[PDB]
């Protein structure tokens, strides 16, 4: 064991050499729904390798004035691969997520990201009574941006976001963060299109900087999410 | 607890459960951190 | 997972100059909180701490009776030229967000499973009219009727929806002790959710609001004065108190900082200046090197 | 019948009473219990979780600027870099923390605190800091010679990016009070101060102005008593549906 | 006959292509309901259902307290030139049909055997006169007297039939908790009948009405204000609530669709248009192929 | 005497309370118990009995016309014949059923439903239908290619005159709500649709326009909770003796 | 066992070849009143063969617009055979009924009847407060017609009539229905002339039809009722 | 003290209730029982005459 | 059940009887229907 990690799910394999650890959210690993907790009586489809694999989303440019980014699960993966098709074709879904955030910079660069898995992250809007529109909330694989990262866009605090399963990417120590998410719902399964269990948020707490010849460096942030123990019930036409 | 009624949910405040597992939130890491050890 | 009835004891510690052992250094990047003990950061004495923890149990922290509803209607003859509607009642649409102390305290967790003890506290005042001689508050009979989701609501004091043949209702007078009952854990799911990152309708229309949970549709409380109208106008104020019992709590949240604005969403305006402003939660001090309450001698 | 005398406290509603009550839904079957991860049994579990402090709570920092402390290379020696008030009850860096917010729901508190500082400069940037906890009695130290005489830790930057200082439980009384009078013997915890031990040294290729993020949590010897309505949240009217 | 505390569990099922086995086909002509299991109609998983059934017990379904009587008389001096009759009381003629919620719920069975808990809820209002100054509701003593079949009924408040030496009577005041007692199963037969396909008289005359049962002649409830008349007019409203206990139920009926019109028979007029019209019980939709609440995206 | 404190809930009348009360007729001997056939112990026994659905709830059918679906020989293929809304709370074919009327006395429900269709044409008339239960999420299917992708049964007419389709319990929550909002996630069950698999074929001697009668019942995995006053029955005044 | 049935009570024997089954109302068979349930102390007369036998009533023409027919028991048999005489001569009666409805049509004909045994069927009249007259209620062996079969002439529903012991005659499957009725009363015996325990109802749910040369076909409906375990108490003059 | 809730039927006088009550003449010695012929235990004995 | 009064009919709601026999109403047929079998 060390600062090195290889994650292997189906076709996919990710390696990192500047890791910290694996954050198992609430010290739990995702598992398939047992019979004692089962509600939907139809036999579920458990596609292991075709769905439980790393889906890499589009990267984001870390800027000096970057407020931060969020991706809502499963919305981020609902129009991607066989996870998307099984979502489009089924009423109910259940899955955990292995999230892996990647950011490479030099030993001369400075900057820190908080990577937070927030359960049931209800976005609050500043300076209005009107609740957030479908467009603002459901952005899919492109994800959304933080307007008020200080308040977690919730009227809460970034300060107290460390209750939530989290890691840091401190360019001194770390180029990659890894958070294992189990199923988080009051119900055993849910409708993927109209509810998100998790929100993976990447907030720059300390800004990206360099010295004299390392300013304005192009530093992307890449997010790879692997569904874990994915189940689907209610086989119908595709929506 | 006492409960003078038929239903169990009608009972008073439940008997104190002093079980604590702060590791869920304080050390939720795959490989456990050893006290005094460099945790890299 | 261990039993903690009393806080941790302190063990006597000695001088330690050992290579390869750095208990005061941690890696915050792992997501793990510092594991450094006082015993290994400083030289400590033996302390046998007998401080109890029962008051910090979630049963004790949430299991106090809190106000969840305050409604006031005028108790009088509401009849006119052509109304025939007495209107000596109110309907609430059950929720736990109207009052911020219980809301912020409940909103410290994502999921809660609890049975709830309810206590209704009624109060009367004579309405200050042009010619009004006070001499005492009538011992009126009140009816609080829980109208579940999809049941017919009352439109008047004299309505027959008040039958309550199957609707749970409680009859209680003014000069009696405040009405009390326990509602069970009554969610369609295994826990109540204080936040819903999603929609409660299958349609994608504006009318389908973000944050509304399809398990918080809990029906309505309809409360009436059973007594027919008095010759004078009274104002009945009803206070409903909620005490969670047999509580299970999951996924602790970041506490609310900005003041609440409504019960339909968690939106905010913030206060004009610190504290609890959108750009400044903690009040300002002059500098990072300034102690505002510095003890001067 | 059963011989009966109604005592004082009869016909009273106490908001902290513990009695069984009439079930409104007789023989109601509640939804079967289902396992959800992250179950909290005690508020003492949450105060043990690290949370960032607004050390930079100044009228020039906005939003995320307030949660980081700008550490720079000094053209001087032994100089004070930043202070931390330990008045949880008063508007200070510890207020908007998991410790602060949840302890602020109580009146009495006892136990040792941990404060962890993460250095967020360059891998090539080096430095030695001295963070000191001064127990109460007199003024906050402004010279390193005075601060070093109290409980302190010397911080060498390196592969381990963070340092903890244990603010140990040092009080005459078994408990302290979250009192509006900061200068009260019942309330005052003392001072935390950070000085340069050597300096911050960064090569030309690396930025000279780095940042430190401060976190605070409670240890396992931590206790709270006498629950109260938090002053964090206020209300002028019943919250409407819209406005 | 088996014990069912929780609903049936679901067993895991496999693919089945077997000749001579057609579990999805039934013969409705036998009068038997389909016996097709989900396990044998689709591919199912193992589900251990812990949903309780205690709330669907006929004891729970019927054993709630329902309103069965609402009567209001004026409490005043009714005396005139030559009356000498005080008239500060009412007589009900016991029944369970005046209020539709308990009637329709009881009428879901042919026969019921239950002991009944009764609760009487009185309420006063000052009568709005030309010159009326309110200052509080007198704590009046009320007397509810059960007058069985063939006993002398009271003709006045001041009558001596109120002796109640052998007639069951309860004395209860306004500011006290509502009066309560249990009446036993008191039918001449082994069960109460909600419907009587026959006549209660031996004669064949029009006066002998169809549907009247010769076991529903249950006598009368006579309720009086025991206090002599006040100097001002009060209106006493009495509400009687019925809670069936120790219930046995037989021969479940088709539920009532049309609104009730009287307590002597089960006749109907129906509503002008659907729903619950004589020719249309369920509301109209455009076509058999039209979804009225179709989810559009 | 016995030391006594009257608590909150003293002097209250709760319509769902479970207490013994004073017997009005002391030492009264009730009529001896006699065996009557068809004794009901649970409302779950009645919802398990089949009851006809108003599938033809249209503003051209009157009385018994509303309980039968006119099935005819088609000059087309794969066409939709009829739909069934599954909104028990809303005015639909399932409302005036034993399932509907008795479930409508409750707020929450869970379990699988059975819907049996009896063909009532001629012995000489043949046909194949496909009845499909679409779980919720999107629009009701209008093409057989879309409907076949959901839970369905293909129905061959013959000596066994009826077919059952099990509407299986497929929901995220342990219970659904009888809510006035049909399009709510808490309430929506989805859709039942019937298409022609082949066609209806009748010889000249037999009528071309046949009928189907639909019945619906609950299975043994069916549950109801949170009793309420049914909206089926209303009242504007105390029901008089005559009028 | 099969789709064929022979019913034999006393002199009588009915055979059918297009049967479905025998419906035993509430899964019970009629039996004689036991001593533990006995009230009337006089020794009862139990005439087996002379009363417990199939009485065939007058047939009814099934029309395209037929609303349906009902027969109230024992009123239907109170002026027929030795069952009638024992009724006329006694105060009290107790009996079950084996009801057998018959309807023959071709394999080319279509139509469906619901045959319902309704206990204590109190007839509700549409558009009046006046309760049904003796004439309207007591029609004897001739029986009565449904004005509102949709409402079971009760302000109830035909839809929910399947609670009651019932069979169907679907001309595809079935030409005969058979329902065994046990004693249904809150009392052990009753007065036959002024109360009916049962109402046998025949409602056309799907109308009688044929194709081009099978229209306007004469299709009667025949009802045969056999009293089962008949008892009589209170021997007096005939009424 | 003993935890107490006054139910419906509290403070009511029912003429058919069966409860013990306060003795007005404490330690009162009633006249010794003496045999009298024709003792009636049931009203059903009189209707048989 | 508890009952503070002399008569048994004065007692509270009777102890839950969970006995169910829906066959009385769902399969009231002389010859029982076998599951999966053609019931003709
Ligand atoms: C979110 C969330 C919502 C809840 C449950 C709140 C309980 O809601 C009530 C309240 C406050 C009062 C009554 C009530 N008050 O009186 C009556 C009665 F009279 F009908 F019995 N019912 C019923 C319910 C379900 O818990 N978490
Ligand atoms: C049909 C049918 C009828 C019944 C019994 C109804 C109970 O009737 C009552 C009612 C509602 C009240 C009283 C009553 N209320 O008060 C008194 C008392 F004061 F006399 F005790 N008696 C007595 C009876 C028999 O059950 N099924």
Author numbering:
A (entry chain B), G (entry chain B): 10 to 248
B (entry chain D), I (entry chain D): 28 to 67
C (entry chain A), E (entry chain A): 7 to 303
D (entry chain C), F (entry chain C): 1 to 243
H (entry chain C): 1 to 49
Text of the article:
Enterovirus 70 (EV70) is a human pathogen belonging to the family Picornaviridae. EV70 is transmitted by eye secretions and causes acute hemorrhagic conjunctivitis, a serious eye disease. The capsid of EV70 is composed of the subunits VP1, VP2, VP3, and VP4. The major capsid proteins of EV70 are organized with pseudo-T=3 icosahedral symmetry, with VP1 subunits forming pentamers around 5-fold symmetry axes and VP2 and VP3 subunits forming heterohexamers at 3-fold axes of the capsid.
Here, we show that WIN51711 and pleconaril inhibit EV70 with 50% effective concentration (EC50) values of 0.26 μM and 0.45 μM, respectively. We found that the binding of the inhibitors increases the melting temperature (Tm) of EV70 from 48.9°C for the virion to 51.6°C and 50.6°C for particles treated with WIN51711 and pleconaril, respectively. Cryo-EM reconstructions of complexes of EV70 with WIN51711 and pleconaril were determined to resolutions of 2.74 Å and 2.31 Å, respectively. The binding of the inhibitors induced the expansion of the VP1 pocket, which required a 1-Å movement of residues Met112, Met192, and Met224 of VP1 away from the core of the subunit relative to the structure of the subunit in the native virion. Notably, the side chain of Met224, which partially blocked the pocket in the native particle, now adopts a conformation that allows the presence of the inhibitor without changing the position of the VP1 GH loop backbone, in contrast to EV-D68, where the presence of the inhibitor induces changes in the backbone. There are 26 residues of VP1 that interact with pleconaril or WIN51711. Most of the interactions between VP1 and the inhibitors are hydrophobic. Moreover, 4 hydrogen bonds connect pleconaril to VP1, providing specificity to the inhibitor-capsid interactions. The GH loop from VP1 of EV-D68 becomes disordered when pleconaril binds to the pocket; a similar loss of the structure of the loop was not observed for EV70. The structures of EV70, EV-D68, HRV14, and HRV16 in complex with pleconaril show that the isoxazole and trifluoromethyl ends of the molecule occupy equivalent spaces in the pockets of these viruses.
